[PDB]
Design a protein around this motif. Sequence first.
Motif, PDB file in Angstrom:
ATOM      1  N   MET B  20       0.844  -1.185   0.000  1.00 60.33           N
ATOM      2  CA  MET B  20       0.000   0.000   0.000  1.00 60.33           C
ATOM      3  C   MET B  20       0.882   1.237   0.000  1.00 60.33           C
ATOM      4  O   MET B  20       1.801   1.350   0.817  1.00 60.33           O
ATOM      5  CB  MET B  20      -0.925   0.014   1.213  1.00 60.33           C
ATOM      6  CG  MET B  20      -1.911   1.156   1.202  1.00 60.33           C
ATOM      7  SD  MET B  20      -2.985   1.139   2.636  1.00 60.33           S
ATOM      8  CE  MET B  20      -4.012  -0.258   2.247  1.00 60.33           C
ATOM      9  N   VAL B  21       0.593   2.163  -0.907  1.00 63.93           N
ATOM     10  CA  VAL B  21       1.353   3.394  -1.054  1.00 63.93           C
ATOM     11  C   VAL B  21       0.383   4.563  -1.018  1.00 63.93           C
ATOM     12  O   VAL B  21      -0.707   4.509  -1.593  1.00 63.93           O
ATOM     13  CB  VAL B  21       2.178   3.405  -2.358  1.00 63.93           C
ATOM     14  CG1 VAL B  21       1.270   3.355  -3.570  1.00 63.93           C
ATOM     15  CG2 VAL B  21       3.057   4.635  -2.413  1.00 63.93           C
ATOM     16  N   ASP B  22       0.789   5.627  -0.334  1.00 65.63           N
ATOM     17  CA  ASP B  22      -0.019   6.832  -0.232  1.00 65.63           C
ATOM     18  C   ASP B  22       0.173   7.663  -1.492  1.00 65.63           C
ATOM     19  O   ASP B  22       1.301   8.041  -1.826  1.00 65.63           O
ATOM     20  CB  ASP B  22       0.369   7.639   1.004  1.00 65.63           C
ATOM     21  CG  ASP B  22      -0.795   8.401   1.595  1.00 65.63           C
ATOM     22  OD1 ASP B  22      -0.551   9.324   2.400  1.00 65.63           O
ATOM     23  OD2 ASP B  22      -1.952   8.078   1.263  1.00 65.63           O
ATOM     24  N   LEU B  23      -0.928   7.952  -2.185  1.00 69.32           N
ATOM     25  CA  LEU B  23      -0.833   8.660  -3.455  1.00 69.32           C
ATOM     26  C   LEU B  23      -0.269  10.059  -3.262  1.00 69.32           C
ATOM     27  O   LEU B  23       0.547  10.525  -4.065  1.00 69.32           O
ATOM     28  CB  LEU B  23      -2.204   8.721  -4.121  1.00 69.32           C
ATOM     29  CG  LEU B  23      -2.529   7.526  -5.014  1.00 69.32           C
ATOM     30  CD1 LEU B  23      -4.026   7.390  -5.168  1.00 69.32           C
ATOM     31  CD2 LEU B  23      -1.853   7.657  -6.363  1.00 69.32           C
ATOM     32  N   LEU B  24      -0.692  10.746  -2.201  1.00 67.26           N
ATOM     33  CA  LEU B  24      -0.196  12.094  -1.950  1.00 67.26           C
ATOM     34  C   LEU B  24       1.315  12.091  -1.762  1.00 67.26           C
ATOM     35  O   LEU B  24       2.013  12.996  -2.230  1.00 67.26           O
ATOM     36  CB  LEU B  24      -0.887  12.684  -0.720  1.00 67.26           C
ATOM     37  CG  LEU B  24      -2.416  12.680  -0.700  1.00 67.26           C
ATOM     38  CD1 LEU B  24      -2.925  12.724   0.726  1.00 67.26           C
ATOM     39  CD2 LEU B  24      -2.963  13.848  -1.492  1.00 67.26           C
ATOM     40  N   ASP B  25       1.838  11.073  -1.079  1.00 63.96           N
ATOM     41  CA  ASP B  25       3.254  11.013  -0.720  1.00 63.96           C
ATOM     42  C   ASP B  25       3.982  10.124  -1.723  1.00 63.96           C
ATOM     43  O   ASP B  25       4.321   8.972  -1.454  1.00 63.96           O
ATOM     44  CB  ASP B  25       3.412  10.491   0.701  1.00 63.96           C
ATOM     45  CG  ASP B  25       2.901  11.467   1.735  1.00 63.96           C
ATOM     46  OD1 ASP B  25       2.941  12.686   1.475  1.00 63.96           O
ATOM     47  OD2 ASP B  25       2.448  11.013   2.807  1.00 63.96           O
ATOM     48  N   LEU B  26       4.221  10.681  -2.909  1.00 64.96           N
ATOM     49  CA  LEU B  26       4.986  10.010  -3.954  1.00 64.96           C
ATOM     50  C   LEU B  26       6.103  10.959  -4.362  1.00 64.96           C
ATOM     51  O   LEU B  26       5.904  12.190  -4.325  1.00 64.96           O
ATOM     52  CB  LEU B  26       4.102   9.646  -5.149  1.00 64.96           C
ATOM     53  CG  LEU B  26       3.127   8.489  -4.929  1.00 64.96           C
ATOM     54  CD1 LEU B  26       2.058   8.473  -6.004  1.00 64.96           C
ATOM     55  CD2 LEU B  26       3.853   7.158  -4.888  1.00 64.96           C
ATOM     56  N   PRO B  27       7.288  10.463  -4.760  1.00 65.88           N
ATOM     57  CA  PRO B  27       7.705   9.066  -4.913  1.00 65.88           C
ATOM     58  C   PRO B  27       7.868   8.339  -3.587  1.00 65.88           C
ATOM     59  O   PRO B  27       8.096   8.975  -2.559  1.00 65.88           O
ATOM     60  CB  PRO B  27       9.061   9.176  -5.621  1.00 65.88           C
ATOM     61  CG  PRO B  27       9.111  10.548  -6.175  1.00 65.88           C
ATOM     62  CD  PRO B  27       8.340  11.382  -5.220  1.00 65.88           C
ATOM     63  N   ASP B  28       7.752   7.017  -3.622  1.00 62.68           N
ATOM     64  CA  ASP B  28       7.908   6.180  -2.442  1.00 62.68           C
ATOM     65  C   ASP B  28       9.338   5.665  -2.373  1.00 62.68           C
ATOM     66  O   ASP B  28       9.777   4.923  -3.256  1.00 62.68           O
ATOM     67  CB  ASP B  28       6.929   5.009  -2.478  1.00 62.68           C
ATOM     68  CG  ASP B  28       6.650   4.446  -1.108  1.00 62.68           C
ATOM     69  OD1 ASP B  28       7.377   4.806  -0.160  1.00 62.68           O
ATOM     70  OD2 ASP B  28       5.709   3.639  -0.973  1.00 62.68           O
ATOM     71  N   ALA B 127       3.483   1.512   4.601  1.00 60.56           N
ATOM     72  CA  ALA B 127       4.093   2.485   5.490  1.00 60.56           C
ATOM     73  C   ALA B 127       3.070   2.930   6.532  1.00 60.56           C
ATOM     74  O   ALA B 127       1.902   2.537   6.503  1.00 60.56           O
ATOM     75  CB  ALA B 127       4.635   3.673   4.695  1.00 60.56           C
ATOM     76  N   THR B 128       3.520   3.765   7.470  1.00 54.20           N
ATOM     77  CA  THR B 128       2.688   4.100   8.622  1.00 54.20           C
ATOM     78  C   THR B 128       1.436   4.863   8.209  1.00 54.20           C
ATOM     79  O   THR B 128       0.321   4.495   8.593  1.00 54.20           O
ATOM     80  CB  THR B 128       3.493   4.911   9.632  1.00 54.20           C
ATOM     81  OG1 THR B 128       4.135   6.005   8.967  1.00 54.20           O
ATOM     82  CG2 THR B 128       4.530   4.041  10.306  1.00 54.20           C
ATOM     83  N   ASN B 129       1.597   5.925   7.422  1.00 46.72           N
ATOM     84  CA  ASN B 129       0.482   6.777   7.036  1.00 46.72           C
ATOM     85  C   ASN B 129      -0.154   6.349   5.720  1.00 46.72           C
ATOM     86  O   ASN B 129      -0.991   7.078   5.179  1.00 46.72           O
ATOM     87  CB  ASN B 129       0.932   8.234   6.952  1.00 46.72           C
ATOM     88  CG  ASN B 129      -0.164   9.199   7.342  1.00 46.72           C
ATOM     89  OD1 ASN B 129      -0.721   9.110   8.435  1.00 46.72           O
ATOM     90  ND2 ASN B 129      -0.487  10.124   6.446  1.00 46.72           N
ATOM     91  N   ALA B 130       0.226   5.186   5.191  1.00 43.38           N
ATOM     92  CA  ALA B 130      -0.428   4.678   3.993  1.00 43.38           C
ATOM     93  C   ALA B 130      -1.922   4.505   4.220  1.00 43.38           C
ATOM     94  O   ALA B 130      -2.723   4.683   3.296  1.00 43.38           O
ATOM     95  CB  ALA B 130       0.210   3.357   3.576  1.00 43.38           C
ATOM     96  N   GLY B 131      -2.316   4.161   5.443  1.00 41.13           N
ATOM     97  CA  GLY B 131      -3.713   3.973   5.773  1.00 41.13           C
ATOM     98  C   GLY B 131      -4.081   2.508   5.855  1.00 41.13           C
ATOM     99  O   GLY B 131      -5.200   2.122   5.511  1.00 41.13           O
ATOM    100  N   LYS B 132      -3.138   1.683   6.311  1.00 36.29           N
ATOM    101  CA  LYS B 132      -3.353   0.241   6.325  1.00 36.29           C
ATOM    102  C   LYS B 132      -4.517  -0.137   7.230  1.00 36.29           C
ATOM    103  O   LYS B 132      -5.363  -0.955   6.862  1.00 36.29           O
ATOM    104  CB  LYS B 132      -2.086  -0.476   6.781  1.00 36.29           C
ATOM    105  CG  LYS B 132      -0.849  -0.137   5.975  1.00 36.29           C
ATOM    106  CD  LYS B 132       0.269  -1.165   6.145  1.00 36.29           C
ATOM    107  CE  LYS B 132       0.272  -1.840   7.509  1.00 36.29           C
ATOM    108  NZ  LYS B 132       1.561  -2.525   7.765  1.00 36.29           N
ATOM    109  N   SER B 133      -4.565   0.442   8.432  1.00 31.90           N
ATOM    110  CA  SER B 133      -5.557   0.026   9.417  1.00 31.90           C
ATOM    111  C   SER B 133      -6.977   0.230   8.915  1.00 31.90           C
ATOM    112  O   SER B 133      -7.856  -0.597   9.180  1.00 31.90           O
ATOM    113  CB  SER B 133      -5.346   0.791  10.721  1.00 31.90           C
ATOM    114  OG  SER B 133      -4.089   0.473  11.292  1.00 31.90           O
ATOM    115  N   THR B 134      -7.224   1.321   8.191  1.00 32.27           N
ATOM    116  CA  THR B 134      -8.559   1.553   7.656  1.00 32.27           C
ATOM    117  C   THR B 134      -8.933   0.473   6.650  1.00 32.27           C
ATOM    118  O   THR B 134     -10.063  -0.027   6.652  1.00 32.27           O
ATOM    119  CB  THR B 134      -8.634   2.936   7.014  1.00 32.27           C
ATOM    120  OG1 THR B 134      -8.105   3.911   7.919  1.00 32.27           O
ATOM    121  CG2 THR B 134     -10.077   3.296   6.701  1.00 32.27           C
ATOM    122  N   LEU B 135      -7.992   0.090   5.783  1.00 36.36           N
ATOM    123  CA  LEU B 135      -8.277  -0.980   4.834  1.00 36.36           C
ATOM    124  C   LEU B 135      -8.498  -2.302   5.550  1.00 36.36           C
ATOM    125  O   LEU B 135      -9.337  -3.103   5.134  1.00 36.36           O
ATOM    126  CB  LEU B 135      -7.150  -1.121   3.812  1.00 36.36           C
ATOM    127  CG  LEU B 135      -7.480  -2.096   2.671  1.00 36.36           C
ATOM    128  CD1 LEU B 135      -8.574  -1.530   1.785  1.00 36.36           C
ATOM    129  CD2 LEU B 135      -6.267  -2.446   1.842  1.00 36.36           C
TER     130      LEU B 135
END
Lengths: 108, 190, 319
Positions: B20-28, B127-135
């Motif tokens: 899972m990658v955060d779209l706002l925070d690119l590049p990863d 990553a931490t702020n990717a939003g894993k827990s919500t998924l």
Amino acid sequence: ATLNQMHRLGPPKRPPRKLGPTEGRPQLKGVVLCTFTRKPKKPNSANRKCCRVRLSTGREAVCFIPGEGHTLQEHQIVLVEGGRTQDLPGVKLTVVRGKYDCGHVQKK
Amino acid sequence: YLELVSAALRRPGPSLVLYMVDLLDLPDALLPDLPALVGPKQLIVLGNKVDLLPQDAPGYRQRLRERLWEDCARAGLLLAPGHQGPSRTVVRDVRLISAKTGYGVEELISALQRSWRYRGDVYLVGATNAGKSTLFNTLLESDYCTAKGSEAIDRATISPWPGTTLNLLKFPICNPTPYRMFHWFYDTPG
Amino acid sequence: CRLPPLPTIREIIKLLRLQAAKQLSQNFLLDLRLTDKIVRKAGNLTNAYVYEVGPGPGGITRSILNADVAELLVVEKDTRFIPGLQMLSDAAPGKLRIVHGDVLTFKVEKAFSESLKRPWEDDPPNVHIIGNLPFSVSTPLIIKWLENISCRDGPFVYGRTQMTLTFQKEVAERLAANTGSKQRSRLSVMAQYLCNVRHIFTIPGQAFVPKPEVDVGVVHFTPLIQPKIEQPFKLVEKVVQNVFQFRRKYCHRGLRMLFPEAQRLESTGRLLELADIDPTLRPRQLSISHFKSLCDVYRKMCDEDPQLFAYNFREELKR
RNA sequence: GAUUAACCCAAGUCAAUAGAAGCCGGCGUAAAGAGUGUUUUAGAUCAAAUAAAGCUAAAAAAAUAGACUACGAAAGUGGCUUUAACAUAUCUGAACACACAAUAGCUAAGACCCAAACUGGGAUUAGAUACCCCACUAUGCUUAGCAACAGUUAAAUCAACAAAACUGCUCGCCAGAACACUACGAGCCACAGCUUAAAACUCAAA
RNA sequence: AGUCGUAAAGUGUACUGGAAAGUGCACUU
Ligand SMILES: [Mg+2]
Ligand SMILES: [Mg+2]
Ligand SMILES: [Mg+2]
Ligand SMILES: [Mg+2]
Ligand SMILES: [Mg+2]
Ligand SMILES: [Mg+2]
Ligand SMILES: [Mg+2]
């Protein structure tokens, strides 16, 4: 429709009128980008003098240049009014003769 | 992560990684490091927080998907989308989701339950702020999970990660449909 | 180059001795202008060797000769048209070589000189086939020639010879159908893993002098340098036929019939799993790569099981 | 286009633009009214069926009666016996409530006598029969799933064509071509294909 | 366009690889 149905629906509601090429304005100022000629739809035959212009609103539009003989070049300022050129499809704007760079038609 | 969690994720067998990658925070910067982190196994990249992105022009979603594809390409990742035929880290799909609004989650479940190769355990890396827990919470309450009760407390179980004391959640999943005609979920530390 | 005028339908009825116009059992294109169009779409024929099938009255023949061909081999089945074709040959000396016989058995491989044989990977070998045959004969012919391309024999001993054939509009669409289209069928795959197939244009039925109740498509075939499935023709044919026998059901419903009932369930699953065919794919949604995968795995299964390739499930349902 | 003359208004003229200016009209064929019943806040005045058990005669589905026109809300129901059994004392009123019913198309399993698209095999002219014969699939089978109502015939009945015109009362629907065209895109796919749209725009027609 | 040539039957739908259209299923006069 019954009286109850007309009471429910209410008075007829005319849709808002459509804005034309001038966006509801008498005239518009424009800058000529290029001059060319277009051929009429065919009950007729000619080479109508036209020019593409960038209007003050920023939109680009094709305009018809009335009269015999014009001296419009690129970057010149013109005033364009409404009125469809009946034989040219999609040409809804006409250049005003005698305003800004576009001068009056030469006599004869 | 490399010294604790990678050992379990590099055990041979049937496995899948939902990176899972955060779209706002690119590049990863974590993307080039995946070959060592997870190993040479199947990987699906999920761009999260797509609902929070302004629509600059029509078809921006396709541009984001493509950009993720070239970002995978720049790193030494094998791009093998779709049917390929009858190792190193291989990216099967790039899917934009939004766990908060549940946009693309159901289509993700359908994609996961339609192929022969998506068999076995799922490892939700990120990553931490990717939003894993919500998924994880979203996927937990769906037909994807083999629910025995309704209450989310019992449906998901806590287990210590092998070889460590890192207690993590997990819920059991279904095999994809082709395996009835003719396995546990895993959240990993961010 | 002055040539005899085209025979009108009156002379054609007189020639076939029918004495009336509703007994031809045949449709002729007696419009030299549409035939000019077809010969134009066949490519640049200047100094080309054209093998023209189904000559008939000779509109196609006249159109081709109008282009500066070198040799035009004609193969006519009926002898009532040989007189007209002989007059055509005399009008244009040295270019028209007429032969009597069936196109389904005629051997084109010896017809032309061996100095025209180009390699398979090089350009098409300046030898063209043009054909306006009965639709009852063009389908067996194209199946035979597709087998020939698979074996690199027959008319394709000269290399990648290009073909321009007229089919029915539906058949032409199916020959040139894409994946997922409503016309995707056996004929599409069979033509398309061996040839670049193009349905150029459709001639309405009203253009043929006895007007048929159908339209006519013109389709161009160019053999592919690299066939998309490297298996024997009959094996691919069997796989495609079994896939497409149930056109509206999932692909596995048709693929289970390749195997005996005793091992039907397990063998079908093994086929699908060693391939990567999602079993919810319906037959029109299979690309030539899916068929390549199925054909490879099926060739393996046959090679480690001799009896399989001869199996026909209807011969087992008889008992 | 120029010129002559005429016409309109006139210290103005009139090119563009924007307003003023319009639904108590219709819904068989032009745009617009049926799958059936019940109920529903309100409004109006018009207060041989079906399901079960059994049983069968000619050759599982029911010749005669039936020239009958009954029962059922509709679809439908016509072999015999027996048992249950055929709502409602005004009308209109559901996309959203409950029952049914039919029509496509796929999904699971199951039966398979018979027939049978496709697919093979046999015979036939001189492009044979597309058409004849044999074999056997999908399928045909069985489950489980995805304008109303009451009154009038008096009037000029009466755009035509259908189907003689009418009133009253209520619901739903209708305000050019246009149920137009189009893939900016989206999904499936995974480099090259498939499925999925409204609006602008144009015209003086349709 | 001519400076161009010439004188039982249907409607749907499905499949069609011997398709100038055929067959299968359901309907209409
Ligand atoms: Mg003024
Ligand atoms: Mg109408
Ligand atoms: Mg009622
Ligand atoms: Mg039979
Ligand atoms: Mg009503
Ligand atoms: Mg057939
Ligand atoms: Mg038919």
